Amino acid sequence: HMKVMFIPSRAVPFNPDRVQGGLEAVHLNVLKYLVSIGADIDYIGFDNDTFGDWKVTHHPVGHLTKFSLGMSYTMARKIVELAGIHEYDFVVTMEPTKLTVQAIKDAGLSKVHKNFMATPFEPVSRGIVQIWDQTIQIHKNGGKSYAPTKAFREFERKYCHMTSALTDKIDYDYWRANPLFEAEDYPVICLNEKPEVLPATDLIISAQRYDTKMRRTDVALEAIKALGENGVGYCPSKWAPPAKYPVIIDAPHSEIMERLKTAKALINTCPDTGTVENSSIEAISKGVPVIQLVFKDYPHATFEYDPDTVRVEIDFSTPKKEVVALYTKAVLEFTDTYEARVKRAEAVWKKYNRDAVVAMWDKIFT
């Protein structure tokens, strides 16, 4: 009954049993929400998407491996066509292109445009400044953007001071005066049933995609290596580690969630925002503690999910050798109680049970 245009994330084709990053996680969950309310979903996607049993109307723009320029123009063109035919209550994006932002405006859909973000602002990154440049554009065009945590909204009040040699085309005048996010959090997880906290084994898990820069997955997989039989890492084949770090490749999300139920801890080495991977809240919802690498006096999402999280504090100056030794030490010496698993799972069950989550989405989709 609700008519929604859906513009997906574009790193990987959609698969309901794969979440290969924080953007893919909100992408999946807002879609699950739209399906659960019986929305009429026009999904402008890729030929290798799969939707299971879900009723979505699919408008594929080609087979997805790397998102190409021709795909980009085919997508924007279909935005304009679909808007000329149907009337849309909302259009949903997940950090869209400049083209997609313009097509939404030209189609007269800016004011019903809902945008969801996970990528921290990185001034040395050309594609990331392009992401956040278009977030300013969305705000100018009358659309609304949503963050997962209040820490992310705080970082946003710092990002509008971060400049580089690549940020010349960014309207910092507008950005300083306009916090880009709405006050409402989008739910990072939807708990359809109260999780049953299982007691821990000795197994500690790394479930983040491999990149040395933002996630510091090398640091994670050093701890995984030092754990031997008591450590396992999961990576997607599109962001796989070098051969020195053996990991399970392309495990279905469900397989990873099953293993996690009895994990002793989750390794998280994303030290700026912790929202470029959803695994922290997945772990904490099962009572699994997170061993969290963090820059000193930074806000980080993990500490919102579990304020008693063990933190390994470092600086930007701290050299790689010392980081690996501080983090390995925290992983190998980690200690947790069953009571602590239950306490941290309860606090998250309060916030993210399905009744509270649906209420959170309902407020967004008005």
The number of domains in the chain is 2
Residues in the chain: 366
| 317 and 174 within one domain | no
Considering the domain boundaries, does residue 321 fall inside one?
yes
**Paired tokens of 233:** 């890492």
The amino acid present at 28, given as its one-letter code, is L
| 154 and 67 within one domain | yes
| 327 and 255 within one domain | yes
Residue whose C-alpha is closest to residue 357's, from 181, 119, 185: 185
Tell me the HSE value of 73 on the side-chain side, using a 13 A CA sphere: 2
Considering the domain boundaries, does residue 53 fall inside one?
yes
d(CA 26, CA 276): 11
d(CA 272, CA 295): 6
Considering the domain boundaries, does residue 248 fall inside one?
yes
Considering the domain boundaries, does residue 198 fall inside one?
no
Residue whose C-alpha is closest to residue 360's, from 153, 223, 189, 225: 189
Residues 100/7, Cβ–Cβ less than 8 Å: yes
At 82, which CATH number? Answer: 3.40.50.2000
- The answer for residues whose C-beta is within 8 angstroms of residue 242's C-beta and 6 or more apart is none
d(CA 71, CA 81): 15
What b/e string do you get for 268-279 counting C-beta neighbours within 10 Å, with b at 16 or more?
Answer: bbbbbbbbbbbb
| 334 and 225 within one domain | yes
**Pairing mode, strands 3-7 and 113-116:** unpaired
Residues 171/136, Cβ–Cβ less than 8 Å: yes
d(CA 366, CA 361): 9
| 36 and 166 within one domain | yes
CA distances from 193 to 62, 120, 148, 197, 350 (A): 37, 31, 21, 12, 12
The range of the structural domain enclosing residue 294 comes to: 204-351
Considering the domain boundaries, does residue 121 fall inside one?
yes
| 344 and 359 within one domain | no
Residue whose C-alpha is closest to residue 56's, from 2, 104, 96, 94: 2
Residues 120/276, Cβ–Cβ less than 8 Å: yes
| 223 and 181 within one domain | no
Residues 235/262, Cβ–Cβ less than 8 Å: no
Residue whose C-alpha is closest to residue 77's, from 48, 52, 53, 106: 106
Experimental method: X-ray
Number of C-beta neighbours around residue 85 at 10 A: 7
| 174 and 66 within one domain | yes
**Distance from the first to the final alpha carbon of the chain:** 14
| Three-class HEC string of the chain | CCEEEEECCCCCCCCCCCCCCHHHHHHHHHHHHHHHCCCEEEECCCCCCCCCCCCCEECCCCCCCCCCHHHHHHHHHHHHHHHHHCCCCEEEECCCCHHHHHHHHHCCCHHHEEEECCCCCCCCCHHHHHHHHHHHHHHHCCCEEEECCHHHHHHHHHHCCCCCCCCCCCCHHHHHHCCCEEEEECCCCCECCCCCCCCCCCCEEECCCCCCCCCCHHHHHHHHHHHHHHEEEEECHHHCCCCCCCCEECCCHHHHHHHHCCCCEEEECCCCCCCCCCHHHHHHHCCCCEEEEEECCCCCHHHHHCCCCEEEEECCCCCHHHHHHHHHHHHHCCCCCHHHHHHHHHHHHHHHEHHHHHHHHHHHCC
The phi-psi region of residue 216 (left if phi > 0; otherwise alpha if psi is between -120 and 50; otherwise beta) is left
| 318 and 225 within one domain | yes
Residues 147/186, Cβ–Cβ less than 8 Å: yes
Displacement of CA 243 from its chain's centroid (Å): 26
Where does residue 333 rank: exposed (0-12), middle (13-18), buried (19+ CB within 10 A)? Answer: exposed
Considering the domain boundaries, does residue 342 fall inside one?
yes
| 208 and 184 within one domain | no
Residues 269/219, Cβ–Cβ less than 8 Å: yes
**Paired tokens of 229:** 């039989």
Residues 73/99, Cβ–Cβ less than 8 Å: yes
d(CA 82, CA 101): 15
| 240 and 209 within one domain | yes
Residues 293/271, Cβ–Cβ less than 8 Å: yes
Considering the domain boundaries, does residue 247 fall inside one?
yes
Beta bridge partners of 311: 292
| 100 and 63 within one domain | yes
**Pairing mode, strands 40-43 and 3-7:** parallel
Considering the domain boundaries, does residue 197 fall inside one?
no
